């Protein structure tokens, strides 16, 4: 699962809500460790 | 990740540090269990 | 690992112990979530 926020600032106003910023509690390549990362996503690729 | 020590057994002194004894809690035949096991390794196969 | 009980509901007595009801902590399709699950099983396919 991802935690997210609406992307804000530096946008055309007709782009509002089209992008979300989200993050992961996903593991490192070592199986015993964890890292936090985040990425830009189109709203179309996610569902609450 | 594995814990290790520089285990010896009447090692010649030009072999020191070439082998390490290390251990981890592995995986088991059932997803719900773990166990600790150790084995010898050549120094070449590991990095701190 | 499975938690289990003998199924005694609605059963002819020469069938006793042929079925067990059991349950487990196996994962949901989300990587970070789990769900309780249970099913009937034939005694032949399980061991203590």
């Amino acid at each position, epitope marked *: 699962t991802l935690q997210c926020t609406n992307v804000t600032n530096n946008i055309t106003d007709d782009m509002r809500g089209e992008l979300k910023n989200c993050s992961f*509690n*996903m*593991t490192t390549e070592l*199986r*015993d460790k*964890k890292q936090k990362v985040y990425s830009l996503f189109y709203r179309l690729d996610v569902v609450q | 990740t594995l814990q290790c020590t520089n285990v010896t057994n009447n090692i010649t002194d030009d072999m020191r540090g070439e082998l390490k004894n290390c251990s981890f*809690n*592995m*995986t088991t035949e059932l*997803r719900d269990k*773990k166990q600790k096991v150790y084995s010898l390794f050549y120094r070449l196969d590991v990095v701190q | 690992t499975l938690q289990c009980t003998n199924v005694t509901n609605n059963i002819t007595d020469d069938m006793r112990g042929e079925l067990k009801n059991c349950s487990f902590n196996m*994962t949901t399709e989300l*990587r*970070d979530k*789990k769900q309780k699950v249970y099913s009937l099983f034939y005694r032949l396919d399980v061991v203590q």
Partner: antibody, heavy 140, light 112 residues
Framework: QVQLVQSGAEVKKPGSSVKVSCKASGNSFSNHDVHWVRQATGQGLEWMGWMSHEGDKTGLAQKFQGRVTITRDSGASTVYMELRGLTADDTAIYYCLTGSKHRLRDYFLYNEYGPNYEEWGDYLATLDVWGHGTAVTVSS | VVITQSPLFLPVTPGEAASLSCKCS???????????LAWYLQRPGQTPRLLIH???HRASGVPDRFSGSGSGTDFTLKISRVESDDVGTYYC?????????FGQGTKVEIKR
């Protein structure tokens, strides 16, 4: 009722360390949390620190950081605590008590090809029965 | 995380119900729904004894006069029919977050 034993009361000079010990009959420390508590007459209880019944965790109330340690005899039949830097305002009744905890996974990721990533933690549930305690005071 | 308790002390008329409260900066509830709250009584001249625990039950061998309440940041301890042997001080405790802590406590004393 497990018997509990603690060190006799002691007077110590200001600016210096003291040490205490405790015991549980039947080597029941293996099944209980080690705890230390401090109290002053006319004042509320203060947790000092603990050790897990597995012995794989220890800790201190933050007031004691860098002044306290906890050790035990092999096979955990007894436990010890050392206090450092004591001054006259450290006069208190000290206690050793047994305890209980709840260990619950706090986070997980299932892995198809390996052990599940897991996070765990301890929540104290109850204090178990209190030791008779020790008294420690500090004077010239 | 911090803990407080009130009233600092309570005068008591014998044979009458009375209660104590404990509050803290964060809920004592856990994601499992577990609560890590416990109350203790210290008679003077004696070590403390568990009264209730995990915000849900009396400790074994505790009189049934004992009860408690609440959720989240607020909890109470109540004793119906308070008796002179309930004199002493009381402490709420948090096992939910490190370092484990006690409330500042309250004192029960018979009114005079």
């Amino acid at each position: 009722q497990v018997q509990l034993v603690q060190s006799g009361a002691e007077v110590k000079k200001p600016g210096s360390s003291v040490k205490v010990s405790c015991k549980a009959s039947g080597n029941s420390f293996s099944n209980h949390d080690v705890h230390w508590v401090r109290q002053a007459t006319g004042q509320g209880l203060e947790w000092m620190g603990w050790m897990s019944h597995e012995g794989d965790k220890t800790g201190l109330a933050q007031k004691f950081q860098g002044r306290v340690t906890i050790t035990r005899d092999s096979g955990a039949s007894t436990v010890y605590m050392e206090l450092r830097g004591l001054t006259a305002d450290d006069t208190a009744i000290y206690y050793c008590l047994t305890g209980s905890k709840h260990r619950l996974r706090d986070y997980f990721l299932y892995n198809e090809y390996g052990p599940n990533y897991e996070e765990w933690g301890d929540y104290l549930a109850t204090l178990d029965v209190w030791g008779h305690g020790t008294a420690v005071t500090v004077s010239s | 995380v911090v803990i407080t308790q009130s009233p600092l002390f309570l005068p008591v008329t014998p044979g009458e119900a009375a209660s104590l409260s404990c509050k803290c900066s964060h809920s004592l509830q856990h994601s499992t729904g577990a609560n890590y709250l416990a109350w203790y009584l210290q008679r003077p001249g004696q070590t403390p004894r568990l009264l209730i625990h995990l915000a849900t039950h009396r400790a074994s061998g505790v009189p049934d006069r004992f009860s408690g309440s609440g959720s989240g940041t607020d909890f109470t301890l109540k004793i119906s029919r308070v008796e002179s042997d309930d004199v002493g001080t009381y402490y709420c405790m948090q096992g939910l977050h490190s370092p484990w802590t006690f409330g500042q406590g309250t004192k029960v004393e018979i009114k005079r």
